[PDB]
Amino acid sequence: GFKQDIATIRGDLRTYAQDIFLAFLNKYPDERRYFKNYVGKSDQELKSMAKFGDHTEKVFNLMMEVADRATDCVPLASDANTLVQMKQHSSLTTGNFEKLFVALVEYMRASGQSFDSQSWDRFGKNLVSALSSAGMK
């Protein structure tokens, strides 16, 4: 289930992080406007940019911690508050997060691994509600 999925992702995190974030950017190409120098590039081109791998891994490092600190897929209020207050997130709204989780869930349902995709959908929804509660537009 959800807890084991965290361990699964953490066991091969860079690969899962890149593949999920790529799924997100390919599903929602206009989301590249938040990220400098990602436009006009194929997956393989992105994966060879030093910053892409480093940054995507850090995002998923933190996502796994938030998920791991959750109870029944409900994140901590302080984790939501940190995500809202991060300067790197100043121009984001809940819809950015919703779209990332739609892509994440769709990646999980399509993959060879027995992810508990329904729990990640719940977690995504609960995170969006928490971000809203913490003051994200």
CA distances from 129 to 32, 66, 86, 98, 134 (A): 24, 14, 17, 10, 9
Q: Kindly report the backbone phi and psi dihedral angles of residue 92, in degrees, each rounded to the nearest multiple of 5, phi listed first.
A: -90, 150
**Closer to its own copies by Cβ: residue 17 or 25:** 25
Reported as type and span, the H/E element at residue 7 is helix 2-10
**Closer to ligand HEM by Cβ: residue 98 or 112:** 98
Q: Kindly report the backbone phi and psi dihedral angles of residue 116, in degrees, each rounded to the nearest multiple of 5, phi listed first.
A: -90, 75
Q: If contact means CB under 5 to 8 A according to the sort of partner, which of its own copies, ligand HEM, ligand 4CH, none does residue 123 touch?
A: none
**Closer to ligand 4CH by Cβ: residue 59 or 76:** 59
**Closer to ligand 4CH by Cβ: residue 37 or 114:** 37
CA distances from 71 to 11, 126, 127 (A): 21, 11, 12
CA angle 23, 29, 35 (to 5 degrees): 95
Reported as type and span, the H/E element at residue 25 is helix 13-27
Q: Is 55 in the site for ligand 4CH (CB under 6 A)?
A: yes
Q: Is 92 in the site for ligand 4CH (CB under 6 A)?
A: no
Contact residues for ligand 4CH (CB under 6 A)?
21, 35, 55-56, 59, 100
Contact residues for its own copies (CB under 8 A)?
1-4, 6-7, 23, 25-27, 29-30, 32, 39-45, 71-72, 114, 116, 118-119
Binding-site residues, in ranges, read 36, 38, 51, 55, 58, 88-89, 97
